[PDB]
Structures are given as structure tokens and as C-alpha cells.
Amino acid sequence: EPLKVEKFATANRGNGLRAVTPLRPGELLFRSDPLAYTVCKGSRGVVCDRCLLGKEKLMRCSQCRVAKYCSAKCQKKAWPDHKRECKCLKSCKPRYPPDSVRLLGRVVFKLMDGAPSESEKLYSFYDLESNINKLTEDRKEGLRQLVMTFQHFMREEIQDASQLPPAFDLFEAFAKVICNSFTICNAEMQEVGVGLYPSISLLNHSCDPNCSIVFNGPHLLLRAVRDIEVGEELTICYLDMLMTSEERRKQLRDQYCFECDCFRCQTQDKDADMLTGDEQVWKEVQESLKKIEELKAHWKWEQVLAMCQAIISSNSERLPDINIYQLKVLDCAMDACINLGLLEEALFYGTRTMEPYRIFFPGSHPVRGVQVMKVGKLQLHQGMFPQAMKNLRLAFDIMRVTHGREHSLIEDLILLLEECDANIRAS
Ligand SMILES: Nc1ncnc2c1ncn2[C@@H]1O[C@H](C[C@@H](N)CC[C@H](N)C(=O)O)[C@@H](O)[C@H]1O
Ligand SMILES: [Mg+2]
Ligand SMILES: [Mg+2]
Numbered sequence: 001e002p003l004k005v006e007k008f009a010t011a012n013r014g015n016g017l018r019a020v021t022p023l024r025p026g027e028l029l030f031r032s033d034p035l036a037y038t039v040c041k042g043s044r045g046v047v048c049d050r051c052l053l054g055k056e057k058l059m060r061c062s063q064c065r066v067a068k069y070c071s072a073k074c075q076k077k078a079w080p081d082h083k084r085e086c087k088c089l090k091s092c093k094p095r096y097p098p099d100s101v102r103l104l105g106r107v108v109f110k111l112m113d114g115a116p117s118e119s120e121k122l123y124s125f126y127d128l129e130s131n132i133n134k135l136t137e138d139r140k141e142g143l144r145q146l147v148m149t150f151q152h153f154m155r156e157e158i159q160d161a162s163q164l165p166p167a168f169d170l171f172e173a174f175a176k177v178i179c180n181s182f183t184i185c186n187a188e189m190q191e192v193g194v195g196l197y198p199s200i201s202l203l204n205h206s207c208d209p210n211c212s213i214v215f216n217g218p219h220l221l222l223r224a225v226r227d228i229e230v231g232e233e234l235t236i237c238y239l240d241m242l243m244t245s246e247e248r249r250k251q252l253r254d255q256y257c258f259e260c261d262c263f264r265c266q267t268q269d270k271d272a273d274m275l276t277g278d279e280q281v282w283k284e285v286q287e288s289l290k291k292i293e294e295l296k297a298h299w300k301w302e303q304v305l306a307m308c309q310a311i312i313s314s315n316s317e318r319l320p321d322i323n324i325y326q327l328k329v330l331d332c333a334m335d336a337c338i339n340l341g342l343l344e345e346a347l348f349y350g351t352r353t354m355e356p357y358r359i360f361f362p363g364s365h366p367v368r369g370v371q372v373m374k375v376g377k378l379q380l381h382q383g384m385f386p387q388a389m390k391n392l393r394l395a396f397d398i399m400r401v402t403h404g405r406e407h408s409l410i411e412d413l414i415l416l417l418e419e420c421d422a423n424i425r426a427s
């Protein structure tokens with residue numbers, strides 16, 4: 001198949017990707033497995049190390065007892081890419097390395113022992129942007145500590161430069177990991193892993209992008225979400241949509257070393273609506289969200305729900321649902337109720353997010369597609385067939401663009417649409 005995309009040198013944002021042919025919304029542009037990936041801090045022992053799917057019971061690697069798998073197939077298939085880190089994870093017990101260190105170990109083993117990776121077809125780990133001449137002294141100190149952490153963790157497998165690729169610099173390698181890591185999300189949009197996809201790392205950022213990525217386990221799909229002309233730069237949004245221009249400025253500086261002067265950032269687009277309600281209340285909710293999100297990252301649903309209900313149904317002052325901190329609380333509560341089987345209560349929170357999600361996820365965004373699908377599924381199983389169908393159709397209109405036929409969630413959605421249709425036909 002001929003490529004619809006190509007690497008090019010941009011005028012002021014380094015290398016990028018641009019369209020070779022005219023592109024339409026939903027068009028599949030690229031697909032990739034990671035060069036290297038690992039389970040996240042919070043999802044370790046909750047999801048399979050290999051397929052990143054959750055299971056009631058996981059089977060642990062007998063040698064390290066750190067890697068956990070859904071099946072014998074996943075444990076065995078993961079063995080070649082786990083063999084060398086196994087000895088390191090076992091040796092350094094009970095200490096567990098930062099996710100970036102575990103990830104870089106897997107990069108090194110892949111580059112040393114594995115065949116050239118399809119993930120590096122357009123751009124390789126060697127080519128990745130490091131932004132070393134923009135790093136602050138504070139960041140360089142942090143990277144030096146990551147380098148020493150890697151040297152300690154990898155002691156059993158990597159003793160010197162002979163066991164690293166030629167002229168491989170660990171400080172530069174961690175600088176590349178900081179601004180090129182992908183957060184892997186499961187079908188429900190829960191963060192479950194971190195990975196490197198060097199060809200996909202050619203995509204520059206936009207606060208209003210024309211492309212979008214989706215994960216199907218560790219597999220990444222890149223799709224157009226707007227019409228794109230020949231030669232037009234392809235962009236993705238690196239950030240959560242529920243962020244003010246000040247919050248985007250801080251992350252883009254701290255993690256990616258750049259300043260954005262796009263229309264949204266120049267006009268603080270949507271900031272005022274995102275921060276409606278009383279500042280003392282949303283500052284408290286924003287602070288509480290640090291704990292709620294940490295609990296959610298560790299799949300502690302009962303504790304997530306308890307903290308969220310204390311806000312949503314507070315005896316004290318409340319926020320509008322369009323306030324992004326209130327909205328994040330509603331979304332955490334919805335996901336906690338779904339995972340706990342409190343479907344009536346999940347629908348209540350989920351329905352409240354629908355109008356704010358319409359506003360903050362314009363066009364076709366996979367996060368809104370999945371949220372609308374969750375609400376439609378909740379309504380379907382409660383027998384609200386005309387309402388469920390409207391939402392399942394809306395979810396399909398978004399997800400046919402953001403997920404496409406190559407994503408297994410689209411098959412799950414088609415089954416809900418057919419189920420809902422049969423129910424309306426028998427009514
Ligand atoms: N909208 C943008 N404006 C300026 N620089 C950007 C923008 N988006 C991404 N970058 C740069 O690209 C880095 C992220 C890489 N994943 C993107 C490809 C990168 N431009 C390269 O040459 O390899 C960031 O850390 C910045 O250096
Ligand atoms: Mg460079
Ligand atoms: Mg530079």
C-alpha cells in the first residue's frame with residue numbers, strides 16, 4: 001500500500017508529517033505497534049503486561065513476580081521482550097523503577113537484540129527530538145537522576161557501552177523519552193501503559209488538530225479527523241482537551257519545550273467557560289482531583305466514587321458541570337460506577353457530561369465518541385431504546401472517524417446498535 005503521509009522539514013517546528021494525497025475524515029493514515037512499551041505504574045498487576053487488558057485474575061512471571069499476564073499465550077509471547085528485564089526486575093526487588101526507566105530498558109533490548117522495527121519506518125529512536133538545548137538546569141538534574149536510576153536497575157544486563165547501541169547516550173535517550181512518550185489508553189480510555197512509536201512521533205501538536213490517534217491494546221491507529229489537502233501538515237493534540245490555555249502553556253513548556261501561538265492560545269479560547277463557578281470551590285476541587293486521579297490510576301473505584309460523591313452531592317457550594325474540574329469529577333464518578341456495577345448512578349453522571357463534552361471535544365474526538373457510547377450502552381440496558389439509539393448513532397458518527405473498522409471497539413458498537421434496533425423494531 002502506498003503511504004498517504006511523508007516526513008518533511010517544517011519551517012519552525014523541526015520535522016513533521018504532511019499529506020501526500022487529499023485526506024478525508026476517518027481515513028486510516030498509519031498504524032503501528034510500539035518500538036517498546038510497558039504497563040503503567042497504576043495498572044501494573046491490574047492489566048496484562050502484553051495485551052493491556054484487565055482480568056479478574058492475572059498470572060505472574062515466576063522468576064521476577066512483577067510481570068503479570070492474562071493467559072499462558074500472553075506470558076509466552078511476551079517472553080522474548082521480557083527475558084532481559086526479568087533478571088533486572090528480580091535483582092532490584094522490592095524497588096520498582098519509574099515507568100520511563102522500564103520503558104528505556106525495553107528500547108535498549110529491542111535495539112540490541114531485535115530485528116529493525118516497523119515502528120521506525122518513517123523515523124527512528126535515533127532521529128527523535130531531544131530538545132537538549134532548551135532543557136532548564138532543573139530538567140537536566142532530573143534527567144541525570146533518571147540516567148543513574150537506569151544504570152542501577154539495568155546492572156545485571158547492561159554493564160558498559162558495549163551492551164548499548166553504538167554511541168548511545170543515556171542522557172539524550174531520556175531527553176527523547178520525555179517529549180516522545182505516548183500514553184497508551186485502553187478501550188474505555190483508562191491510561192494503562194506508556195510506549196514509543198517513533199514514526200508517529202513525527203506528528204507535531206495542535207490545540208485544534210486535523211488527526212487523532214487511538215489505541216487498540218498496544219496497537220496505534222492514526223486517522224484524519226478533518227479534510228486535509230496535499231502538502232498540509234498533519235497534527236495531533238498532545239494534551240487532554242479539558243485544560244485551560246495556561247495549563248496547556250505549562251505542560252507544552254515543561255514536557256515539550258515549546259510555546260504555542262495558535263488561535264486558541266492567543267484568544268484563551270474556552271478558558272472562561274471552563275472556569276465558571278466560584279474560584280474557591282473549583283480550586284478545592286482541582287486540589288482534590290490530584291488524589292481522585294491517583295486513585296483512578298490504581299483502579300481503586302470505591303475510593304474514587306466516595307471522593308467524587310463528596311463533591312457532586314456536597315452539602316457545601318457546588319460548581320456548574322461545564323467547569324472542567326467539576327466535569328473531571330463527574331467523569332471519574334461515571335467510570336467508578338460503571339466498574340462497580342452502579343449503572344443507574346453511572347447514567348446520571350454520564351448524562352450530565354454530555355453537553356459539556358459536546359462543547360469541549362469539537363468535531364470528531366475519540367474521548368467524546370467513547371463517552372457517548374458508554375451513555376448509550378447504559379441507556380440501552382435500562383430499556384431507554386429511542387434515547388440509547390440516538391446516543392449509539394452519535395457515538396458511531398464520531399467513532400467511524402476516530403476508531404474506524406480496524407478498531408475492535410467499532411465491532412462492539414455495531415453489536416449495541418443492532419441490539420437497540422431489534423428492540424425498537426419489536427416495540
Ligand atoms: N505546535 C508546535 N510548535 C513548535 N514545536 C512543536 C510543536 N509540536 C511539536 N513541536 C516540537 O516537536 C517535539 C515533539 C515531537 N514528538 C514532534 C516531531 C518533532 N518536531 C521532531 O522534529 O522530531 C516538541 O518537543 C517540540 O520540539
Ligand atoms: Mg535532533
Ligand atoms: Mg531544537
Ligand SMILES: [Zn+2]
Nearest residue numbers: 048051070074
Ligand atoms: Zn494478555
Ligand SMILES: [Zn+2]
Nearest residue numbers: 061063064086
Ligand atoms: Zn519475569
Ligand SMILES: [Zn+2]
Nearest residue numbers: 207260262265
Ligand atoms: Zn495552542
